[PDB]
């Protein structure tokens, strides 16, 4: 809310960092309009200086820089953060690991893949599937964000499902500390119990203890059959059968399950122009599988498909094994956030809540909230209790957010929930934790970040309560 | 040697506020705290006064702020199957016994996230969730007497990591005392939770130098409907790595287990296990599980697999066992081999992650380098994770043959980019090759955090961080 006391960047510190980082030093105020915005573009910051280093000692030396000057620095990657974090509020100096786009190895045995964490990660799935290996994690933002972003948040995402946390698909980061000390937990051993694991802490970290350099990931082998199946389902409580049944007879060739009601799919077809290829349902459930042999997926698809169709579970559903058609299905779900985006004012919650409870709120905040909210809509991880939770309105009111905050946070609290399962805290949840973390956790929390960046130069009014 | 550094010592004014904080739960007798002073290797033994068995934990919280006030140090302990020398005591450590705090809070017979205290032991919670059609994310050949509190500390691999993945993952959420007695909740029975830094994760691994672990949220995956186990006979190491080739090729997602032993092994089991061979006598054998939905389907898949292994001779000699009791008889041939290794003699234990085509290079090296001093050399182990369990068995304890073995088998192993310590962790015996493993930078911020969060060192001292 208040600017705190760091130092301002004089016309000396500008040739330092063009000595630090020749060619990497943007002072263009229009080139810095873009950065300051982020992506739901409700918050813009004011920062006029852009610094884009190409290696890790360029980053090391810019963040002793700012040690000794008390400057702030804001890291930025693909700016696909949905909770304002990735952007500044002031005038923080933004770091940009644009530039830091290189992959250093790739062992085409056990997987391994080590990068730089500006990585875009469409290109790194480009790259490894080339080599019959695919990323841990996928995301609607994979054309934008970067590894270094993904590792900053734990991202969860698609095959999350299927392939589980970065806490533990991450074998290894390289990491630039406030003061410019270069942390190397950069191994690439499946397994190395040595000490503490350090890089842990800075997984969903979000920039506060410091600036991931290198990641250093397990990539899973490129599945040899991945099925798709878009079903339409006559309600919630059949929704939850089809995902028991699912994982009673597909077992462990699921790699994902996702829903999404039927607003969701009126608004990717009114703003985003994709056809619904199912007919008009309540809610849609999107099923992957991958696999080694096709046949037996097949097999599996088709005996879950008729024992759904035949108990009245699915009303009616599409298959898809072609590249082009999965890609399709998948599109329906992976742009639901675009097209709410476009739909007006979006009030975006992401919780973690009880599956089998997982749409009450959504069907409690359309009682609650009449003709004053423009949309309400529920989607996303079933399979991981995650629900995205939007509401749209015509235009921002605070008479809607009085009847949004905190009922909603306070409902998730009453569920024993996350009031960020995903997206992470950034600037817009720092002042909400307390709805699923203890005072004593955040305590802790707020003494690593003392002992790790004592001057609070890296993020600051982020990602801790204030 | 090391030092005892100055902590008070054990009053029979702390005796009598032990036995108000935890009745009945205070062991002073001489005789009784033998076996909790004495590692599973028999190679290590402390001299500590007394064994507290809480039940609860605001008991730990109690005890160990009472330890925080008086200076006095604390040696947790669960099973006291850790291979490294962190469970047992030093010098006069009081053993902190996580043994009475075994009870289930929680099952969620839907998300299977099972709630439940430190103490429970691993095989008894296997076959609480079993009955319910779960199953636990780990397996340990030392599952009947380790603690699931033990497991998290000491971040524990085993025999199903090539399929479920790290604690690291799989641990949800934790409820830990740290050594001032502050309970720290991040006891989260959630899939996904994204509000701040995960600071479970600092606990587990940590071996007992951050906090005493009390209580454990975990994600049990479902039963398998189908379990199979094949157990091959490989002509060579070569073939060994073609066999693992080859099953993740045609087994793909139904595997759940690759696990090696040498020749040397099968003897050793056979010897003193009594445990006859069921394949031809090979200088390498395989053990390798499937887990899938679809009996079937998982039968094809290892027909196929078999057929091409054994048509291209990878294997030599394979039988499989779908059987319960059959495939707990293969099961038993690998899960036993640490026992009749330490009934051979004394051993000389490693623990190593090295590049998987270079896995067993170490042992023909050791069986050369090393001669009639020896009585035996074996590698086996985690082939999948890259993981070996490298042994060497004497009659008796030499320092000639240490000698020979270290700094050895470390400098061998950094010049491998491996690690010194692949699962079973630091302790006290590996405390001091970290640098084989580690850089400075990130083991003086391992010191930083220990001082953060035990200032005063009282718990687990003379571990699991460089002197
Ligand atoms: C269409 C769309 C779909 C999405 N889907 C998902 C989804 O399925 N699951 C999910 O979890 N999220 C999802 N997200 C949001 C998600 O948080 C980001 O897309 C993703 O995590 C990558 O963020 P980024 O690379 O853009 O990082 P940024 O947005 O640039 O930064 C995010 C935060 O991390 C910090 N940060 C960035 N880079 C670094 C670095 N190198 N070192 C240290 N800190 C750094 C920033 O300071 C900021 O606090 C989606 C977003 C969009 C727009
Ligand atoms: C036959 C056999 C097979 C094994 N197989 C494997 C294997 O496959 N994979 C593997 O990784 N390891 C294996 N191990 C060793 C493994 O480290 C232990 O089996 C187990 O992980 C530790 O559990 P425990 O309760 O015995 O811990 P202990 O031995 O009692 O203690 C382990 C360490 O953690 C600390 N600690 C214990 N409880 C707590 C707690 N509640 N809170 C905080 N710190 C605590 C102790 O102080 C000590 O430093 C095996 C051991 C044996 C004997
Ligand atoms: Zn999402
Ligand atoms: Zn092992």
């Given at each position: ?10 016309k ?6 063009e000595?630090?980082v ?6 263009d ?6 950065p ?12 006029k200086?852009?610094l884009?280093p190409?290696t ?5 030396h ?10 702030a620095?804001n ?13 500044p509020?002031f ?10 786009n ?8 056990s997987?391994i893949?080590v990068c ?9 799935s ?5 080599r ?7 995301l ?17 995402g ?6 589980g ?6 074998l290894?980061?390289?990491?630039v500390?406030?003061?410019g ?8 051993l ?6 503490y694991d350090?890089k ?11 600036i991931?350099?290198?990641?250093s ?8 059959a ?5 079903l339409?389902?006559?309600?919630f409580?059949?929704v939850l ?14 790699s994902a ?12 077809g ?9 007919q ?7 099923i992957?599988?991958s696999?080694?042999?096709?046949g037996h997926?097949?097999?599996k ?13 699915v009303?009616?559903?599409?298959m ?5 058609k999965?890609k399709?299905?998948?599109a329906?779900?992976?742009r639901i956030?675009?097209?709410l ?7 975006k ?10 749409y ?6 359309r ?22 939770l ?5 235009a ?6 009085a009847?949004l905050?905190?009922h909603?946070?306070e409902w ?14 950034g600037?817009?949840?720092r ?8 005072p004593?956790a ?7 970040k003392?002992?790790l960046?004592?001057k609070?130069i890296?993020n600051?009014?982020?990602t801790?309560?204030?």
């Amino acid at each position: 809310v208040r600017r705190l006391p760091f130092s301002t960047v004089s016309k000396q510190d500008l040739a330092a960092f063009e000595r630090i980082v020749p060619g990497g030093v943007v002072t263009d105020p229009e080139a810095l309009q873009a950065p300051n915005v982020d992506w739901l573009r409700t918050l813009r910051g004011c920062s006029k200086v852009l610094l884009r280093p190409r290696t890790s000692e360029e980053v090391s030396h810019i963040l002793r820089h700012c040690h000794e000057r008390n400057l702030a620095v804001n890291p930025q990657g693909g700016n696909t953060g949905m909770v304002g974090g990735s952007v500044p509020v002031f005038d923080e100096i933004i770091l940009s690991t644009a530039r830091m786009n290189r992959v250093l190895s790739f062992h085409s045995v056990s997987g391994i893949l080590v990068c730089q964490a500006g990585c875009v990660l469409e290109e790194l799935s480009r790259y490894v599937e080339e080599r019959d290996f695919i990323m841990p994690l996928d995301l609607g933002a994979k054309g934008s964000c970067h590894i270094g972003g993904n590792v900053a948040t734990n991202a969860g995402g698609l095959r999350f499902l299927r392939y589980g946390s970065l806490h533990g698909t991450v074998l290894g980061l390289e990491v630039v500390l406030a003061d410019g000390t270069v942390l190397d937990c950069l191994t690439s051993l499946r397994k190395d119990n040595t000490g503490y694991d350090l890089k842990q802490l800075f997984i969903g970290s979000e920039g506060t203890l410091g600036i991931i350099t290198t990641v250093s990931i397990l990539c899973p082998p490129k599945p040899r059959a991945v099925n798709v199946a878009f079903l339409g389902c006559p309600g919630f409580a059949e929704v939850l059968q089809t995902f028991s049944t699912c994982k009673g007879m597909l077992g462990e060739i699921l790699s994902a399950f996702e829903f999404m009601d039927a607003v969701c799919m009126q608004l990717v077809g009114r703003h985003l122009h994709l056809a619904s290829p199912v007919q008009e349902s309540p809610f849609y459930v999107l099923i992957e599988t991958s696999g080694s042999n096709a046949g037996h997926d097949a097999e599996k698809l088709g005996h879950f498909l008729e024992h759904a169709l035949g108990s009245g579970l699915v009303t009616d559903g599409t298959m898809a094994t072609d590249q082009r058609k999965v890609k399709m299905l998948w599109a329906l779900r992976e742009r639901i956030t675009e097209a709410l985006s476009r739909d007006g004012y979006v009030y975006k919650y992401d919780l973690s809540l009880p599956v089998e409870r997982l749409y009450d709120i959504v069907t409690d905040l359309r009682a609650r909230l009449g003709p004053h909210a423009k949309h309400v809509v529920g989607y996303g991880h079933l399979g991981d209790g995650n629900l995205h939770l939007n509401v749209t309105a015509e235009a921002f009111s605070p008479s809607l957010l009085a009847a949004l905050e905190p009922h909603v946070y306070e409902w998730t609290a009453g569920q024993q929930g996350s009031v960020s399962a995903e997206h992470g805290v950034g600037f817009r949840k720092r002042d909400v934790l307390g709805y699923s973390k203890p005072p004593g956790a955040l305590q802790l929390m707020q003494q690593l970040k003392a002992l790790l960046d004592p001057k609070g130069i890296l993020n600051p009014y982020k990602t801790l309560p204030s």
